[PDB]
């Protein structure tokens, strides 16, 4: 709810490392879908260097994702709302562009609701481990019955 | 037996024939299935379902639209519907909805 885009750029270099999901076989989800429309934490190099492909924080749109795909680029660090330095809200750069419009997210859009709504709506199609109750256990932080120890 | 009964009918076994658009008069590519289906009219009839209200009566205890003349109280606007407005930037639509 009350979570809303407030600042413009919190101005943090911080972000999370995005790789393709590679679940046990081949590419259950590519890199291009994972990183699309997000903003770079730092400039990315080619396999060789003294080459700035994407310069620091830049929205990765379709051309940028394909220029990264032209090259062999295997890994990308991305600003996320979890890392945003803005307090009491999200800096527009840390979130992403996504909307019904492709442009970067506007200042003041209430993203928490559209985030929650987007997660909840498809939930009809999940199963009855696995399924929809499994999702809830994740979001409820619930400790499994016989956990491991680290 | 169905196909056999269609033979006595003089009608094709496919149960499909060629049909022609009454507009352009030209044929329809592929055969289409034509036949006779028993069909029911349920009573969900649209001039039962249809309701509209501009300014009607109001509940006394809470001043809220309430139908008393059968010019029905307005459609009930919910929490989920509020979120839909909250996801959108519509502040003024939302204020006017629950105030004026």
């Amino acid at each position: 709810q009350d979570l809303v885009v407030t600042e413009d750029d919190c101005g943090t270099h911080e972000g999370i490392m995005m790789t393709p999901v590679i679940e046990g076989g081949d590419v259950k989800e590519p890199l291009r879908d994972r990183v699309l429309g997000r903003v770079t934490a730092e400039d990315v190099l080619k396999p060789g260097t003294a080459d700035i492909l994407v310069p620091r924080n830049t929205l990765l749109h379709e051309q940028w994702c394909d220029l990264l795909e032209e090259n062999s680029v295997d890994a990308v660090k991305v600003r996320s709302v979890v890392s945003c330095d803005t307090d009491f809200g999200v800096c527009a750069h840390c979130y992403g562009r996504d909307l019904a419009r492709g442009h970067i997210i506007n200042k003041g859009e209430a993203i928490g609701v559209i985030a929650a709504q987007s997660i909840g709506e498809p939930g009809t199609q999940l199963t009855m481990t696995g399924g929809l109750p499994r999702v809830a256990d994740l979001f409820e932080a619930r400790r499994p019955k016989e956990p491991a120890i680290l | 037996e169905i196909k056999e009964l269609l033979k006595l009918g003089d009608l094709p076994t496919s149960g499909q024939i060629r049909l022609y658009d009454g507009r352009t008069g030209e044929q329809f590519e592929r055969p289409v299935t034509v036949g006779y289906m028993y069909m029911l009219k349920l009573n969900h009839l649209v001039d039962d379902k249809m309701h509209a209200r501009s300014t009607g009566s109001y509940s006394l205890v809470t001043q809220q639209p309430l139908g008393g003349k059968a010019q029905f109280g307005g459609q009930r606007f919910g929490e989920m519907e509020v979120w839909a407005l909250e996801a959108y930037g519509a502040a003024y639509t939302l204020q006017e909805m629950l105030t004026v």
Binding site: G108, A110 | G89, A91
Partner: peptide, 19 residues
């Protein structure tokens, strides 16, 4: 205090703790 209203609240929130 979001969307169209975010301009408003912002303009009001700042009026506070002032004079």
């Amino acid at each position: 205090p979001a969307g169209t209203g975010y301009a408003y609240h912002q303009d009001r929130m700042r009026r506070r703790a002032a004079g």
